[PDB]
Amino acid sequence: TEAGRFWAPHPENVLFIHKPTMEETRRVALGLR
Amino acid sequence: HPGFAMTVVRTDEVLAEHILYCSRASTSMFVGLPSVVRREVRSDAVTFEI
Amino acid sequence: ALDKSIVVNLTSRLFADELAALQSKIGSVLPLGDCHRLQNIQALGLGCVCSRETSPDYIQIMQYLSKCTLAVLEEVRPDSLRLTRMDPSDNLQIKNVYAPFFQWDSNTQLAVLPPLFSRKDSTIVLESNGFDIVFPMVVPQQLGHAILQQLLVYHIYSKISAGAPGDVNMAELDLYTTNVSFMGRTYRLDVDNTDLRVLDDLSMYLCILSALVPRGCLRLLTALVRHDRHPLTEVFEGVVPDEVTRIDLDQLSVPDDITRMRVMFSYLQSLSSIFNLGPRLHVYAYSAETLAASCWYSPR
Amino acid sequence: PTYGDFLVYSQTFSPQEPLGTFLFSFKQEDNGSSMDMLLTPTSLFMLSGMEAAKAPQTHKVAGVWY
């Protein structure tokens, strides 16, 4: 939380996409469209 | 003559030899004890502070 | 409670001419090869290592000054000189009689450097004993790390002009090297280009680095790929030149590369310390009219 | 010890200090006889100009000395 420490090599936020839950919201919403 | 007048300010300093008057017995004084403290001791000199 | 005094005797009496030059510098810093009070003449200068018959050295003097004991003149009596001893963290007084004259200020850090300038500015020849005492070049640390650097660049381009004329202009080289700006003031140093054999050893070392360093860092980057690589080393791949990254390391074999990497590091620690670590002493008081600086010596 | 004696403009060295602060001697050129420049770590915070949250406490205090 400092302006000089912006691009830390290990930041506090880590992306986590759970791929089985993502495929089902694709396939349901591609069924409706 | 240009379109404007102007005013000018100097200073001047004067030596003076004053007459300080001091009435009797106003300020009481308190005289302590002098201490001595060494500082900056070299191979060439030993200096003190009183 | 301890007694420190260093009294050097001689074999023959001094001349009347040579006594006036030592009275000119009655406060000084001499190196001195022994710690005991009674001692012969052959150590108290730089004549023990540096001489006219031997080839002049930089590094073998800078190796020597860190190994040597310093001393300060008190009184010059014929023939027995009278120094005083320099102790670790000891407070004493220095007068600054050195040629050429660099202006001292208080709260500066004095660095004893070897004399790389002319002979008559540096030494005082004793004709009675036939031995040369050499006063070291005491220069403030930021000048001493800059009066070396521009003269070491001057020695490089003098070696390029002697090999090929069209690569270097003399007016470009003289204007940007012999004039040294420090503390607002300028100093035009004596070039002595009349024939700088002092700095040939450093000009050999810094060039042999300069070829082997970019050859060396390519192998040391690729040989450290890990899961536990330090995260700052990802940054410095953007610093290395793109021509450096295109080396075919197939050209040099394994029995050649171990010879390089041991030559790689062995110059690096030998060249790092000789820029860093010398006998270096602080100054906390100074007056330009008396030319008297009070100092205290830090041994490193 | 070996003391040092410094003669400072009263604009730089704030008149009240906790009497044990560490010091520095910035030096650019000898212009006069003896006028010396001294930098406390709270004074060197103000010349820096860094952000507040880098040192959140001394920014308030070094902004009232200066």
TrEMBL record, chain A:
<protein>
    <submittedName>
        <fullName>ORF 19</fullName>
    </submittedName>
</protein>
UniProtKB/TrEMBL annotation, chain B:
<protein>
    <submittedName>
        <fullName>ORF25</fullName>
    </submittedName>
</protein>
Automatic annotation (TrEMBL), chain C:
<dbReference type="InterPro" id="IPR002690">
    <property type="entry name" value="Herpes_capsid_2"/>
</dbReference>
<dbReference type="GO" id="GO:0005198">
    <property type="term" value="F:structural molecule activity"/>
</dbReference>
<keyword id="KW-0167">Capsid protein</keyword>
<protein>
    <submittedName>
        <fullName>ORF26</fullName>
    </submittedName>
</protein>
<dbReference type="Pfam" id="PF01802">
    <property type="entry name" value="Herpes_V23"/>
</dbReference>
<keyword id="KW-0946">Virion</keyword>
<dbReference type="GO" id="GO:0019028">
    <property type="term" value="C:viral capsid"/>
</dbReference>
<keyword id="KW-1048">Host nucleus</keyword>
TrEMBL record, chain D:
<protein>
    <submittedName>
        <fullName>Core gene UL38 family protein</fullName>
    </submittedName>
</protein>
